[PDB]
Each structure stands twice: as C-alpha cells, then as structure tokens.
Amino acid sequence: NSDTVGWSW
Amino acid sequence: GPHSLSYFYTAVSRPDRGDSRFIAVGYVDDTQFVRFDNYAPNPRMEPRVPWIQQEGQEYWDRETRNVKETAQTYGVGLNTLRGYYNQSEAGSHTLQSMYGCYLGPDGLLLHGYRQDAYDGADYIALNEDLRSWTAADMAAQITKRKWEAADEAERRRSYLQGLCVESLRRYLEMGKDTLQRAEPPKTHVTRHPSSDLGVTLRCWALGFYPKEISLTWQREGQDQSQDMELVETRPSGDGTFQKWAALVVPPGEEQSYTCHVQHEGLQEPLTLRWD
Amino acid sequence: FVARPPKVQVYSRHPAENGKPNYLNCYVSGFHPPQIEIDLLKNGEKMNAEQSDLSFSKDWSFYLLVHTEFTPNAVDQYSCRVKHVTLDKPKIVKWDRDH
C-alpha cells in the first residue's frame, strides 16, 4: 500500500 | 536481514509536451511487485508478481486513485522547486521520492524513511525520529517550513508505523513461497586463457536471491581482493541475481585458489574451486 | 547539474550454449539524468527488446534492464549501445559468454 498523497512542496 | 516495503517515485518535467511523466514502482525486499506509469492514457497501478494479483478490484482502484493524485502533486512539485531555484522553464528536471519501512525481528517497524531529491541531489528528508525534517539547502527549507506548519511529519510517521508495516506483513504472507524462501546461488568456476598466456579463473554465482552476496578469492587464506575483478550484482531477468569474481592465476597452480561464497540461502559459507 | 555516466554490463541469463534458447541482458546503472537510449544489437543491427520500469538506487542514480530472447551460436555477434548526455559518443559493450 503506497502512502497517501503528500503535502505541497 | 529484516524485510522491507519500499516505493520509488520518479517525476520528470517534459518541457516539450507540457507536462510531466510519473513513474512509480513498489518493492518488497528485492522484489518489484507493482508499478505505475502515467505515460500511457488510462494508467493503472499494475501487478508485477503472481502473489500480488490475488488482491481485489478495490485494492487496485484505490492504489491507482492514490498514485494518480500523487503524480499530479509531483507535477506541481517540479514547477514549485523550479521557482525556488530560479530556473528557466527551458530545461527538464527530475523530482525523485524514496520511502519505505524495515520490519524488525519482532515484526514491528525497525526503520522508517522518506527522502526526496531534486535533479539527483538530496532535497529534503524525514529524520529517523519520523518527527523532524532535514533540508539539504536554502530552497528545501522553504518546504521544511511549510511542512512543519502543516504538521506533515505526523502523517508520514503514522503511515510508516501503520499501513506500511501492516501491508508488508500481509505481502510477506501472500508471497510466502517466494519472499520468505531463500534461493541459494548456483556456482561454478570456469577457466579461460588471458593475456601473456595467461590463465584467468572466474567464479560464477547465478540465480540467487536475495541480492546481498559475498564472493571472495583465497590462495592459502591470504585474501586476493586487491588484484581481483568483481562486477556489480546484476538482475537475471527472472527475479534472481548474478555476480562473478575473477583473478589471473599461474597455469599449473589453479587449484591453489578457492572461491568463497556467502549467502543467506546457504546454511554455511561455500568453498569453491576449479575442478 | 551534476550528471553521472552510465555503467553497462552485457550478459546472458544462463550460461550460453550454442543453439540454446537464452536471454540477453543489458544492465545500465548509476546514471543521471534519467534520459537515455539503450539498444541491444545483433551484428550491429538493433534488436526488438523490452525495457524495465525506471528505478533508482539509494544514491538517486537510475538503473535499467533491457532484455530480449536470443540464441547464441558460433557466428552471431551481440552488443549493447548506450547514448547519454555524459557520453561524447555512443558507448558500445560487446557480449561475451565469459565476460
């Protein structure tokens, strides 16, 4: 299971 | 040693096509089991091994859905860092991500990691404490400040300590017959003519897994590391690995030399010879 | 801006026998940026091959495997040609059943 979408850079 | 689940993202801005290509691959130990490429219309998170196929439609739907949003975030990412570095929009750039979890002997998270790189150099990384960030340079600090303010850390920590180790355990069991059974190297020592005539001994280690292995040469115990040729461990194409080591020897004293092989698939170190 | 040249290894999956179905691998690694051209050649002419999904090592350098079916004999020559921004001219490595 990939990690959920991260925060904006 | 310990098992691990790892994901590798590679985003590349295409200043010629106007967007970015996003490629993501998944690994359990030395085994790729999933992949995603947005280069093709209607891209999906696809299986790479038999054991990952027993997953339901929902699993793929939600991985695809996840990596899709992620590809987009990396596209914006390339554009953002482009600004941070004051870079023209004329060249192409790469944003890489590397994260995963190492399962300890207990079956718990032993090691969690998440690192990013811009154009092949460290950009930002999550620390071993999974609580703070290390920024490589000034630009990276702009993200570090944004991520601290957003409390981005606790979300990476929770995934690493939770879903990541749980998935990994679930995978290790699903692919038990391959991921947990060791595949010892098949070995043999060949003999070939060489310069000045000229005989070279070559020790082959074939079709082994995992990747980690040790090939050494010994004449009477004295290590022969200095004047021996060792090649990088390479994939066989079927999921296993290859590697050899070679050294010139006097024609007539070949059996004086022994090849020493060590691998977690072998109960004990292997002693090899030209025979 | 630091570009890294590719390393190349041409080899077969199994020890080559003349007339035996095998697999020809070209392992390119340690390069950056990712853009690269990898061709497997048969007698200098390009073979139809497939290429692994881009991935990279702990040091961020990319690696790729290009591979295809081939049947070695005592006559046919094989090699791998690689083009990269770090290379003035294409890097060709001949295949050798011994290395």
Give the start-to-end residue ranges of the domains of chain B: 1-181, 182-272
Q: Could you tell me which of B115, B160, B84, B88 has the C-alpha nearest to residue B8?
A: B115
Asked if residue B49 lies in contact with residue B116, where contact means CB atoms within 8 angstroms, the answer is no
Provide the 10 A C-beta neighbour count for residue B99: 23
| Joined tokens for residue B132 | 């703070």
The span from the CA of B200 to the CA of B1, in Å, is 34
Asked if residue C48 lies in contact with residue C40, where contact means CB atoms within 8 angstroms, the answer is no
Q: Could you tell me which of C80, C21, C50, C25 has the C-alpha nearest to residue B240?
A: C25
The three-state secondary structure class of C77 is coil
Give the domain ranges of chain C.
Answer: 1-99
Strand partners, B115: B98, B125
Dihedral sign computed on CA atoms, order B139, B141, B143, B145: negative
Scan for tokens 């995992």, then name that residue.
B210
| Joined tokens for residue B9 | 């993202």
CA distances from C85 to B78, B211, C79, C81 (A): 21, 30, 20, 14
Contacting subunits of A (3+ beta carbon pairs below 8 A): B
Chain A closest-CA separation from residue B151 CA (Å): 10
| Joined tokens for residue B246 | 């070679």
Cβ-nearest to C56 among B10, B119, B232: B10
CATH 3.40.630.10, domain C1-99, yes or no: no
The span from the CA of B235 to the CA of B22, in Å, is 24
User: What DSSP letter does each residue of chain B carry, written as one string?
Assistant: --EEEEEEEEEEEETTTTEEEEEEEEEETTEEEEEEETTSSS---EE-SGGGGGS-HHHHHHHHHHHHHHHHHHHHHHHHHHHHTT--SSS--EEEEEEEEEE-TTSSEEEEEEEEEETTEEEEEE-TTSS-EEESSHHHHHHHHHHHHHTHHHHHHHHHHTHHHHHHHHHHHHTHHHHSS-BPPEEEEEEEE-GGG-EEEEEEEEEEBSS--EEEEEETTEE--TT-EEPPPEE-SSS-EEEEEEEE--TT-GGGEEEEEE-TTSSS-EEE---
Window 149-168 of B, Cβ < 8 Å to A: 150, 152, 155-156, 159-160, 163-164, 166-167
Could you list the beta-strand ranges (E) of chain C: 7-12, 22-31, 37-42, 45-46, 50-51, 55-56, 62-70, 78-83, 91-94
The span from the CA of B239 to the CA of B154, in Å, is 35
Is B66's CB within 8 Å of A5's CB? yes
Asked if residue B102 lies in contact with residue B3, where contact means CB atoms within 8 angstroms, the answer is yes
Expressed in Å, this structure's resolution amounts to 2.6
Q: Nearest residue of B to residue C64 by CA position?
A: B235
Rg (CA), chain B: 23
Asked if residue B165 lies in contact with residue A9, where contact means CB atoms within 8 angstroms, the answer is no
Which of B231, B233, B243, B247 to mutate to test binding with chain C, by most C CBs within 10 Å of its CB? Answer: B231
C50 interface with B at CB cutoff 8 Å: no
Is B77's CB within 8 Å of A5's CB? no
The span from the CA of B115 to the CA of B99, in Å, is 6
Is C55's CB within 8 Å of B117's CB? no
Asked if residue C6 lies in contact with residue C36, where contact means CB atoms within 8 angstroms, the answer is yes
The span from the CA of B124 to the CA of B117, in Å, is 7
Provide the 10 A C-beta neighbour count for residue A7: 14
CA atoms within 13 A on the CB side of B172: 16
Contacting subunits of B (3+ beta carbon pairs below 8 A): A, C
Is B235's CB within 8 Å of C62's CB? no
CA distances from B94 to B14, B58, B104 (A): 10, 31, 33
Chain B closest-CA separation from residue A8 CA (Å): 7
Pairing of strands B229-230, B241-248: antiparallel
Cβ-nearest to A3 among B76, B146, B159: B159
Dihedral sign computed on CA atoms, order B150, B12, B70, A1: negative
CATH 3.30.500.10, domain B1-181, yes or no: yes
Architecture of domain B182-272 in this structure: Sandwich (2.60)
Q: What determination technique applies here?
A: X-ray
One-letter amino acid identity for B244? W
Chain B closest-CA separation from residue C20 CA (Å): 17
Chain C closest-CA separation from residue B244 CA (Å): 9
The span from the CA of B156 to the CA of B164, in Å, is 10
Cβ-nearest to A2 among B66, B81, B114: B66
The span from the CA of B269 to the CA of B203, in Å, is 15
Element holding C21 (H helix, E strand): none
Inter-chain Cβ pairs, chain B and chain C, closer than 8 A: 73
